[PDB]
Enzyme design. Structure first.
Site, PDB file in Angstrom:
ATOM      1  N   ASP A  48      89.942  29.935 -30.429  1.00 40.24           N
ATOM      2  CA  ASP A  48      89.883  30.919 -31.502  1.00 40.24           C
ATOM      3  C   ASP A  48      89.855  30.253 -32.873  1.00 40.24           C
ATOM      4  O   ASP A  48      90.472  29.204 -33.080  1.00 40.24           O
ATOM      5  CB  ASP A  48      91.086  31.858 -31.392  1.00 40.24           C
ATOM      6  CG  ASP A  48      91.124  32.885 -32.490  1.00 40.24           C
ATOM      7  OD1 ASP A  48      90.222  33.744 -32.521  1.00 40.24           O
ATOM      8  OD2 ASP A  48      92.073  32.849 -33.307  1.00 40.24           O
ATOM      9  N   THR A  81      90.389  38.434 -33.023  1.00 38.86           N
ATOM     10  CA  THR A  81      90.653  37.313 -33.916  1.00 38.86           C
ATOM     11  C   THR A  81      89.388  36.547 -34.279  1.00 38.86           C
ATOM     12  O   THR A  81      89.035  36.460 -35.462  1.00 38.86           O
ATOM     13  CB  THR A  81      91.676  36.392 -33.258  1.00 38.86           C
ATOM     14  OG1 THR A  81      91.144  35.914 -32.015  1.00 38.86           O
ATOM     15  CG2 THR A  81      92.963  37.158 -32.975  1.00 38.86           C
ATOM     16  N   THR A  82      88.696  35.994 -33.284  1.00 40.71           N
ATOM     17  CA  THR A  82      87.568  35.105 -33.540  1.00 40.71           C
ATOM     18  C   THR A  82      86.418  35.832 -34.241  1.00 40.71           C
ATOM     19  O   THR A  82      85.528  35.187 -34.810  1.00 40.71           O
ATOM     20  CB  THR A  82      87.093  34.499 -32.213  1.00 40.71           C
ATOM     21  OG1 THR A  82      88.227  34.021 -31.475  1.00 40.71           O
ATOM     22  CG2 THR A  82      86.207  33.308 -32.471  1.00 40.71           C
ATOM     23  N   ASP A 382      98.618  40.093 -27.068  1.00 36.39           N
ATOM     24  CA  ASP A 382      97.388  40.858 -26.923  1.00 36.39           C
ATOM     25  C   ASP A 382      97.689  42.306 -26.570  1.00 36.39           C
ATOM     26  O   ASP A 382      97.377  43.215 -27.347  1.00 36.39           O
ATOM     27  CB  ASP A 382      96.499  40.221 -25.861  1.00 36.39           C
ATOM     28  CG  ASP A 382      95.953  38.890 -26.297  1.00 36.39           C
ATOM     29  OD1 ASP A 382      96.047  38.586 -27.504  1.00 36.39           O
ATOM     30  OD2 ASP A 382      95.420  38.156 -25.441  1.00 36.39           O
TER      31      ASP A 382
END
Lengths: 508, 509, 517, 512
Positions: A48, A81-82, A382
């Protein structure tokens, strides 16, 4: 005269685009993880962007802005996120051109910022509602959204823990935002993923009580934010150093105080005393603390003040820096306060139930080792976040950037109908979208170009008759194997990026 | 030493002023676009502002001329309550304007004297551009609202301004005696959102004495006081305290109690229902005040103590030079109230209705402290717009008015003055360029249009920089209070000339 | 070791008076663009009479090193034309080198310049009149006191400041038998008032000392009683206190205070005024108990401050509590507490009519720099009237006196001839500089402007008219009402050729490799 | 060890000798190139004499450094002849050095050097004209006609006659030495030239206006003069001195003690004899209140010369004891007067028991006026007081310089070989002296000097350039004068360091 800002803006957007580009390989699970030797000369291995972008970063302000933009998606959704990192340069690919093309920086901003809402609005068309009231559905959908992603490992067990902890602190059928504010994540060394469990009161650091009863039920929760000690010279015992009778007599000073200061602690009375760390103290007189617990008040010392801060709110134990601040209101009312050294290894005071505002939940994260604890956390985080997003966003959306391959077509289509100077922009705006799932089609391996081009027509047909299915990494329905995410991570990445891209255009 | 003589020092007078113009003009107006603030002492640390005042600091100013304008900025920023980024580039424009012309050999003497009455030539036109708005109160409502969002716009609050655009005018709407920064009480407190920002109508103590003193007292007779109930201030009753012995701790403890009990009873001789102490109140007196049914507020905020005294119509204890002689505030209610998340002791029924306590509700303080800061800026204008309820067409419209005025005055005056005065009249027309260039629209279009508009004498039509077209100045909100421009039109039309006087510049560093 | 010879020296010599006098030439007149000074620490300030800026300049060159000295006595006695001489001393050298550029001795022409001064002097002596009188001189001084404060601080000055400035002089100017020097008159700057506001005082005015306003804040009489010693028990301006061993000693302690006051008072009461100037400070407590007693003191007075009120009154400071007389006290026709501005405490106003060895004009101010800029302006004009009131001699010029003396001295060089035929010509060429070179800084053309008052010299000589230094429509010295003291220009004539001769004096340039410090 | 040999040193020796001579070259003429020589010490050098400047610098060559000393000596001899010996031996080394390459240095060098100057000093001493009293003048007009000569350079007016007469008498009154140091003119701002005082006593330039200074006597028939090397200033017992303070009684005591140590030291010198108190160091306003309350005149930060100058004339010794009870370190006059002269408060010691200072007090209340005046008045002393020293006065302006080089050339025939040349070299060296003025008087050397050498081939008596008259003429008739002593003195010091370094191609040193 505005040359240099463009040059700076170039220098900005360049190093902006730059740091956001490197992740576009590591983007996604098939995104390749980089072992990175750092300024420390030592390897660092992550996928990430955020961790990657933080763990080695120099200073470029736009780059510094993006590691925040990266962190933003994190601190915003805890999720997707990424993704936000990839859209910025994608947008800037349009912007820099349009800037080269000459579109005024204020325009492109409000161009894409207007065009933002149109994208997520067609996303709301793409959006598929799942039940935020039904814990099962959330247990079903979020885990499946987690099964659209890597970790079901402890999750499929800890989503029963995550969805519940959330469901327990879920008041509404909407389940609203629900930050993890009422979910206390604490670990315990010993135990299991199964000994990981939700607990209905606030587990306190160890239980630090010397003569303090191992359990006191119906706990006044005392808080000691003031020192237990008489003044120091060389110890809690104040020592003037020549001959040993003075330091023996100044005890009568010192001893009586730490006794009375304690006697004052038991005057109003406390069943539990919250005591933060003694280095979160100037120092705490054991002389007191001895006679403190020797007046039989169960205590936890060595606790984080932010625990206390978490505890000051969630169980409503109001901060006590002082003995006037010893009061049944500032001394929190616990239904039950115990310690469990057991059900695994390590010792923690268990508040089980309490007087608490906003429900409350603590999850005590256990396992055969710390790692089994650690990934369990990473299994819930998560789940913790994807739920609180999925509940934050009434509907659900399939993942893999296919909605963008839909939406890139959608907005460019309307960007025609939009016309205006921004038609060129709002198309190029949407055109920025498909590059990201392309990069995934490259990151999973495929033609990033051939496929996503065709998907735009696939997404011109059923809008999903195909999508980017990560395990397939190719043209597929992403509803046949669900590649699915809450609406936010889509919105989040978008709403962040444009703003982060917006001001830069307005930045000189 | 190092003497910077005219040309070099003039180019040096240019280097900062002109380049300082670059950013502050880039940020000029809402579509004025930000400059990154690089903190070279603190990391590289980046900040992004639409304000030039913040720019004037982070990276410091060497250039004396620019160093001068930092005053002018702050001067205009603080005095005008607005025009921060404006008056600055205004000095940049004319110096830039004077560059080629003094490089055309033209004396600043020639220049300055030209821009002198040229500055004044705009005035009568400006004084003509004075448009009385707010003369009527419904006007004054919208008149305040006209400039309400105007100041906060370039003061870098783009979000909650609307919420304050409604709030700030209300406090100013009631004043009408004068624009009042004192009767109006300024409070900003955390809790609630920044669009939850609150207006307490009355005095407010953000203090809370809690139930330690009576929380609810109706028709409360206030003692506004500095009177120390522990420290025990002057008109002291007793001998000067002394320690001659190990056990002497007792008498000094007992001696102060009387001294405390005196000012308790003495202020209990006010009959005041609520005791407001600008100092603290000790245990013995506060337990006496509490047993007296009197609310004793300790260490109350200094200006608020007077604001309380003012707005409630009461008097302050005068450092207990008045034992009973201090007049008493009376407000129909003293109530500790939860607004947002916090309990504050709210005084309504205070003797001043024009007085308003705006309680700004922070979602965080970092915006909240910036909120009132920039919010207080419109108040200056608004307070002076209370005094002069007047307007000037903004968006470079009054510019284009004063442009032609001096642009013809150039041809009306002409001479070594119109040498300068044309250069002057260009900086007049250079202001409409910036905001349009900030808005990224064609200035020579929007200017020469607005020129043709003011060549047709239309100052009710101007550059409307929201959409950045040429359009009405009807007081769409695009119109400015007459206060700002005459203020902003001034110092740079001064300082630029003032800078033209310093020629030999001896820098002994 | 190095030796820079002659022309080499002369080259070095000229490298300053070219630019560093041009610093004045750029500053000539109000229309002369004024001089910013940025300090060693980077502190920006606007300057004129560049002996200021020359002292603020740090000298790398002997001429620069010298000029401050040469500029001083001009700014000392005259107070104005500090810009003129530096130009003029910087100018003629430029003509002078040009003659050694022609291959002429500095020796010869300087001589011919020395007496070129003299022949300009008498020619200058003709201009205006050499007598002005009290009612006459004031308004032209009130013009000068204006146009000094009207050019150099305010634009109109103020008929407060102008008149109060000439009167400060005219006060002691009459005391000194139609002379004065500065120390006799002192501008006291304090800000918080307005530039406009100037309190003309015959003596000291400083902030009074009280404790409680409920206890009397009062001046007694018009007389001051000056004390080094206590009027209130003396505390050597350092740590001193009172202490008691019992509640009753506390009672015994305060009557000590009141009786010592009375003790001190009764002495200082009977020997004249009551009113103390007491060097040392006393506790702010029994200070009001002295007020409560009676007849306030002044405590924490500066060591020299007691002396300032001492002799200026004509009296002294009382050196000892036991040594007491009105002579050792103050002599004042006025002493009264007066609030300075509305912004702070009463200044104790001592207007000393029993004597003034310093008549100290107080000035309020809006800002330091501008009340400075006033005080800046003042002492310049203070010294020109000071020239006048000493010998009342004025000269129409700065547009005239030059081109006046520029005419005849160069004309004289026709009747001079040989070595002085170039001198008194080129001498007056330096005269040609300033009024021209003034108009240089002005938007008007100096060459053009010169040609006019040139043509005027064909019309009219030693004229009441001239160039406009005020950059007006009229070009005069009279409709301008511009002028200097016929002293000053003549005094200004002294200095220019004085350095011209001065760079000549010895043959010795020989240096360690250091001709600069 | 460092050393040198050979002509490359010998010429190098000469060169630096030639360099330093060009500094002082025309310097004693009022005109030239004046550059302030300001050093890393911060000291501007406008010095007329190069000796002071020779004090400031040094020469790598002892060669040039040596002649400096004797030229400084020649300066330190008469106070005059600074440039004189400086040029001569240099001009010598200037003259011959091409012959040095031909060779001269064989000791036939010195054999010519000493001779022709011994020829001169007699040829001088015969033309020396002895005048003191009733030889020409009153004995008083000598100094005048020598002073009126010196003052003739300064233009101005009959003030020269006002001056000359006054610059004469102190030289006669004080007469001890050639020193004008104690005689020294004290420049006074204020007063015209028409009043410029000659004080046979010691009359102080500036004493300060103090507290009660006008209230203490400025007048004595008997200054009893405390010459104090220490200050009585009010800080000798500080006003920040503290004490135990319980009540407000103790306050009264401390400042009293602050006051007395001052009064103590000063009254003890007051109580001695002293109605005049002179501190070369400051005075406190309370200390001068004591002085005012003493009714005995005082001064502080007094000029140490005026302190010493009083020590000379008034008999008082500079008092190392500030507590002194001694009346012998005290001194008297038969008048102490203080006239404020112009603006300065100006003391008179006069009727002094000794003439050990008769000091001239110059006025004109200016700088141009006065500094030019007193400039010549130094040589309206140094010449006139030397006109007393050597009553044989040889005309200035090169009167002998050319008439000698005349005969020196006239003798230069028969002297053979090398020294043949060296005589003409020696002779030509005299001819720099008048050409000092030719630049200053604005003339050619050659013609103007060939005029003189015509006149010295013809009249030959006193003919020489007269600089401030810008002409040539018989100088001793023209009043252009110097007592024949320093000439031979310079002439003796001329050929000497010349014949020394001309024997030096060899200079030796050590680094270690």
């Amino acid at each position: 005269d505005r040359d240099k800002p463009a040059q700076i803006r170039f220098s900005n957007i360049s190093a902006a685009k730059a740091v956001a580009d490197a992740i576009r390989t590591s983007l996604g699970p098939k995104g390749m993880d980089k072992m990175i030797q750092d300024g420390k000369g030592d390897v660092t291995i992550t996928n990430d962007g955020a961790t990657i972008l933080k763990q080695m970063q120099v200073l470029h302000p736009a780059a510094r802005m993006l590691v925040e933009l990266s962190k933003a998606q994190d601190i915003e959704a805890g999720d997707g996120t990424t993704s936000v990192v990839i859209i910025a340069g994608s947008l800037l690919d349009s912007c820099t051109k349009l800037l080269q093309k000459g579109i005024h920086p204020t325009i492109i901003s409000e161009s894409f910022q207007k065009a933002l809402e149109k994208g997520i609005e067609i996303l709301t068309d793409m959006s598929r509602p799942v039940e935020l009231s039904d814990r099962e559905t959330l247990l079903n959908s979020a885990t499946t959204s987690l099964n659209s992603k890597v970790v079901s490992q402890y999750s499929s067990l800890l989503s029963p823990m995550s969805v519940n902890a959330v469901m327990k602190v879920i008041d509404p059928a909407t389940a609203t935002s629900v930050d993890l504010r009422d979910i206390k994540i604490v670990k315990k060394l010993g135990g299991t993923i199964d000994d990981c469990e939700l607990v209905e009161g606030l587990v306190l650091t160890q239980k630090v009580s010397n003569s303090g009863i191992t359990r006191v039920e119906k706990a006044k929760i005392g808080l000691i934010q003031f020192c237990l000690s008489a003044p120091k010279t060389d110890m809690d015992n104040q020592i003037v150093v020549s001959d040993y009778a003075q330091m023996d007599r100044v005890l009568r000073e010192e001893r009586a105080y730490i006794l009375n200061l304690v006697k004052q602690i038991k005057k109003t009375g406390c069943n539990v005393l919250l005591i933060q760390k003694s280095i979160l103290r100037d120092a705490l007189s054991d002389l007191a603390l001895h006679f403190l617990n020797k007046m039989k008040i169960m205590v936890i010392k060595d606790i984080e003040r932010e625990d206390i801060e978490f505890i000051c709110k969630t169980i409503g134990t109001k901060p006590v820096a002082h003995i006037d601040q010893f009061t049944a209101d500032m001394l929190g009312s616990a239904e039950l306060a115990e310690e469990v050294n057991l059900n695994g290894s390590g010792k923690l005071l268990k508040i089980t139930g309490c007087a608490s505002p906003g429900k409350t939940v603590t999850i005590v994260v256990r396992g055969s080792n710390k790692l089994v604890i650690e990934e369990a956390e990473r299994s819930i985080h998560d789940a913790l976040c994807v739920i609180r997003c999925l509940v934050k966003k009434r509907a659900l959306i399939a993942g893999g950037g296919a909605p963008e391959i839909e939406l890139a077509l959608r907005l460019t289509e309307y960007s025609r109908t939009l016309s205006g100077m921004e038609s060129y922009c709002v198309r190029a705006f949407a055109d920025a979208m498909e590059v990201i799932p392309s990069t995934l089609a490259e990151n999973a391996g495929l033609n990033p170009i051939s496929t996503v081009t065709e998907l735009r027509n696939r997404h011109a047909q059923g809008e999903k008759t195909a999508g980017i299915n990560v395990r397939k990494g190719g043209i597929s329905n992403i509803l046949e194997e669900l590649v699915v995410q809450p609406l936010l991570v889509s919105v989040s990445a978008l709403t962040l990026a444009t703003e982060t891209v917006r001001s830069i255009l307005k930045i000189d | 030493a190092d003497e910077e003589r005219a040309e070099t020092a003039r180019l040096t007078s240019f280097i900062g002023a002109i380049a300082i113009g670059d950013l502050v003009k880039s940020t000029l107006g809402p579509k004025g676009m930000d400059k990154i603030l690089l903190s070279s002492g603190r990391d590289a640390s980046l900040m992004v502002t639409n304000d030039g005042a913040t720019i004037l600091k982070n990276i410091g100013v060497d250039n004396p001329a620019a160093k001068v304008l930092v005053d002018m900025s702050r001067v205009q920023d603080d005095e005008v309550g607005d025009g921060t980024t404006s008056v600055t580039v205004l000095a940049a424009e004319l110096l830039r304007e004077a560059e080629s012309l003094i490089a055309k050999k033209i004396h600043p003497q020639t220049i300055i004297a030209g821009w002198r009455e040229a500055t004044k030539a705009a005035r009568e036109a400006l004084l003509s551009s004075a448009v009385d708005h707010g003369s009527d109160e419904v006007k004054f409502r919208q008149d305040l609202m006209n400039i309400a969002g105007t100041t906060l716009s370039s003061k870098l609050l783009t979000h909650h301004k609307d919420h304050f655009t409604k709030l700030a005018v209300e406090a100013v709407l009631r004043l009408k005696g004068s624009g009042n920064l004192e009767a109006i009480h300024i409070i900003k407190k955390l809790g609630g959102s920044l669009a939850d920002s609150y207006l307490d109508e009355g005095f407010l103590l953000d203090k809370k004495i809690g139930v330690n003193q009576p929380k609810r007292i109706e028709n409360a007779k206030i003692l506004i006081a500095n009177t120390g109930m522990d420290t025990d201030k002057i008109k002291i009753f007793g001998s000067r305290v002394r320690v001659d012995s190990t056990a002497k701790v007792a008498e000094i403890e007992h001696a102060e109690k009387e001294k405390m009990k005196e000012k308790v009873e003495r202020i209990l001789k006010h009959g005041i229902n609520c005791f407001i102490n600008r100092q603290l109140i000790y245990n013995y007196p506060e337990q006496l005040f509490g047993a007296a049914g009197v609310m004793a507020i300790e260490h109350a905020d200094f200006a608020g103590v007077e604001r309380l005294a003012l707005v409630t119509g009461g008097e302050i204890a005068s450092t207990f030079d008045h034992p009973e002689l201090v007049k008493l505030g009376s407000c129909k209610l003293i109530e500790e109230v939860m607004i947002g998340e916090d309990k504050l002791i709210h005084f309504s029924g205070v003797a001043l209705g024009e007085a308003c306590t705006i309680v700004l509700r922070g979602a965080t303080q970092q915006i909240l402290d910036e909120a009132e800061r920039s919010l207080h800026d419109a108040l200056c204008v608004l307070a002076q717009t209370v005094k002069d309820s007047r307007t000037v067409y903004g968006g470079g419209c009054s510019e284009m008015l004063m442009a032609h005025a001096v642009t013809q005055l150039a041809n009306r005056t002409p001479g070594k003055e119109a040498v300068a005065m044309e250069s002057y009249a260009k900086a007049l027309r250079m202001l409409p360029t910036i905001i349009a260039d900030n808005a990224g629209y064609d200035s020579a279009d929007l200017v020469a249009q607005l020129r043709a508009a003011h060549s047709e004498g239309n100052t009710t039509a101007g550059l409307d920089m929201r959409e950045g077209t040429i359009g009405d100045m009807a007081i769409l909100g695009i119109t400015e209070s007459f206060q700002v421009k005459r203020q902003v039109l001034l110092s740079a039309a001064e300082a630029a000339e003032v800078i033209l006087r310093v020629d030999n510049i001896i820098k002994a560093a | 070791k190095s030796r820079l010879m002659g022309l080499e020296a002369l080259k070095s010599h000229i490298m300053a008076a070219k630019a560093v006098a041009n610093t004045m030439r750029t500053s000539l007149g109000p229309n002369g663009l004024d001089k910013m000074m940025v300090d060693k620490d980077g502190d920006v300030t606007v300057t004129n009479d560049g002996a200021t800026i020359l002292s603020m300049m740090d000298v790398d060159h002997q001429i620069a090193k010298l000029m401050v000295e040469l500029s001083k006595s001009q700014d000392d006695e005259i107070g104005d034309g500090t810009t003129g001489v530096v130009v003029l001393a910087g100018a003629l050298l430029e003509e002078a080198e040009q003659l050694l550029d022609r291959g002429i001795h500095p020796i010869r022409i300087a001589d011919g310049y020395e007496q070129a001064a003299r022949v300009a002097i008498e020619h200058l002596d003709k201009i205006s009149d050499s007598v002005l009188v009290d009612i006459k001189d004031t308004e032209p001084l009130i013009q000068t006191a204006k146009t000094t404060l009207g050019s150099k601080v305010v634009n109109s000055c103020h008929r407060q400041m102008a008149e109060i400035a000439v009167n400060a002089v005219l006060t002691v100017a009459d005391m000194e038998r139609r002379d004065v020097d500065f120390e006799l008159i002192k501008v006291e700057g304090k800000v918080g008032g307005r530039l406009e506001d100037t309190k003309l005082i015959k003596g000291v005015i400083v902030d009074k000392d009280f404790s409680h306003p409920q206890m009397p804040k009062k001046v007694e009489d018009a007389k001051i009683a000056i004390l080094t010693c206590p009027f209130e028990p003396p505390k050597p301006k350092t740590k001193h206190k009172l202490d008691v061993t019992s509640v009753e000693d506390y009672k015994a302690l305060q009557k000590y205070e009141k009786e010592k006051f009375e003790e001190m008072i009764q002495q200082i009461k009977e020997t004249g005024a009551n009113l103390a100037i007491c060097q040392w400070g006393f506790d702010d407590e029994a200070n009001h108990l002295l007020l409560q007693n009676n007849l306030p003191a002044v405590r924490w007075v500066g060591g020299p401050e007691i002396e300032l009120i001492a002799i200026a009154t004509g009296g002294r400071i009382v050196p000892r509590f036991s040594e007491l007389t009105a002579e050792k006290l103050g002599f004042a026709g006025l002493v009264q507490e007066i609030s300075f501005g509305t912004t702070k405490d009463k200044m104790l106003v001592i207007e000393q009519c029993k004597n003034s060895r310093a008549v100290t004009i107080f000035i309020r101010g809006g800002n330091k720099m501008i009340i400075e800029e006033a005080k800046r302006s003042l002492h310049d004009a203070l010294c020109v009237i000071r020239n006048l009131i000493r010998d009342n001699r004025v000269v129409y010029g700065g547009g005239a006196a030059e081109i006046s003396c520029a005419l005849a001295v160069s004309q004289e060089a026709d009747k001079c001839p040989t070595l002085e035929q170039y001198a008194m010509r080129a001498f007056a060429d330096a005269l040609e500089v300033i009024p021209m070179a003034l108009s240089e800084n002005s938007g008007m053309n100096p060459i053009q402007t010169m040609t006019e008052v040139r043509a005027r010299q064909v019309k009219e000589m030693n004229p009441a008219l001239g160039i406009d230094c005020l950059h007006k429509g009229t070009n005069d010295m009279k409709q301008q009402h511009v002028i200097e003291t016929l002293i000053g220009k003549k005094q200004q004539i002294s200095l220019a050729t004085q350095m011209v001769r001065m760079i000549l004096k010895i043959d010795d340039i020989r240096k360690p490799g250091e001709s600069e410090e | 060890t460092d050393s040198s040999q050979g002509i490359p040193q010998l010429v190098s020796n000469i060169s630096a000798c030639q360099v330093i001579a060009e500094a002082v070259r025309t310097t004693l003429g009022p005109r030239g190139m004046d550059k302030l020589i300001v050093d890393g010490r911060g000291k501007a050098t406008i010095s007329n004499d190069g000796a002071t400047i020779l004090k400031l610098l040094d020469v790598v060559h002892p060669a040039a450094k040596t002649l400096v000393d004797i030229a400084k000596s020649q300066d330190a001899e008469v106070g005059d002849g600074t440039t004189s010996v400086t040029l001569l031996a240099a001009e010598f080394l200037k003259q011959v050095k091409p012959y040095v390459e031909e060779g001269l240095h064989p000791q036939i060098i010195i054999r010519a050097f000493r001779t022709a100057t011994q020829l001169a000093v007699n040829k001088i001493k015969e033309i020396a004209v002895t005048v003191k009293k009733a030889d020409k003048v009153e004995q008083r007009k000598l100094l005048e006609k020598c002073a009126m000569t010196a003052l003739s350079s300064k233009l101005i007016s009959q003030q020269k006659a006002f001056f000359a007469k006054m610059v004469v008498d102190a030289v006669m009154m004080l007469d001890d030495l050639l020193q004008l140091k104690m005689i020294g003119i004290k420049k006074v701002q204020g007063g015209a030239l028409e009043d410029s005082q000659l004080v046979a006593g010691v009359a102080f330039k500036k004493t300060f206006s103090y507290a009660g200074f006008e209230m203490q006597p400025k007048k004595y028939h008997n200054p009893k003069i405390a010459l104090l090397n220490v200050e009585l200033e009010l800080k000798a017992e500080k006003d920040n001195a503290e004490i135990r303070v319980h009540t407000v009684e103790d306050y009264q005591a401390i400042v009293d003690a602050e006051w007395n140590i001052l009064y103590d030291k000063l009254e003890k010198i007051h109580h001695s004899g002293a109605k005049v108190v002179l501190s070369k160091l400051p005075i406190g306003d309370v200390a001068t209140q004591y002085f005012a309350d003493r009714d005995m005149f005082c001064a502080g930060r007094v000029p140490e010369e005026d302190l010493k100058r009083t020590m000379m004339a008034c008999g008082g010794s500079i008092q190392t004891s500030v507590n002194a009870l001694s009346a012998d370190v005290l001194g008297r006059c038969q008048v102490f007067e203080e006239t404020q002269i112009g603006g300065e408060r100006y003391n008179f010691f006069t009727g002094c028991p000794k003439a050990k200072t008769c000091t001239f007090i110059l006025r004109g209340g200016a700088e141009q006026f006065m500094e030019e005046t007193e400039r010549s008045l130094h040589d309206a002393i140094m010449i006139v007081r030397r006109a007393i020293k050597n009553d044989s006065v040889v005309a200035g302006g090169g009167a002998i310089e050319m008439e000698l080089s005349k005969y020196l050339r006239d003798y230069s025939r028969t002297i053979p070989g090398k020294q043949q040349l060296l005589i003409g070299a020696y002779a030509k060296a005299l001819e720099i002296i008048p050409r000092q003025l030719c630049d200053n008087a604005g003339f050619d050397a050659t013609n103007i000097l060939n005029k003189l050498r015509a006149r010295h081939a013809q009249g030959g008596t006193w003919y020489g350039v007269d600089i401030n008259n810008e002409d040539i003429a018989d100088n001793f008739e023209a009043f252009v004068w110097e007592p024949a002593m320093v000439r031979i003195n310079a002439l003796t010091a001329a050929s000497e360091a010349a014949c020394l370094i001309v024997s030096v191609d060899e200079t030796i040193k050590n680094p270690r």
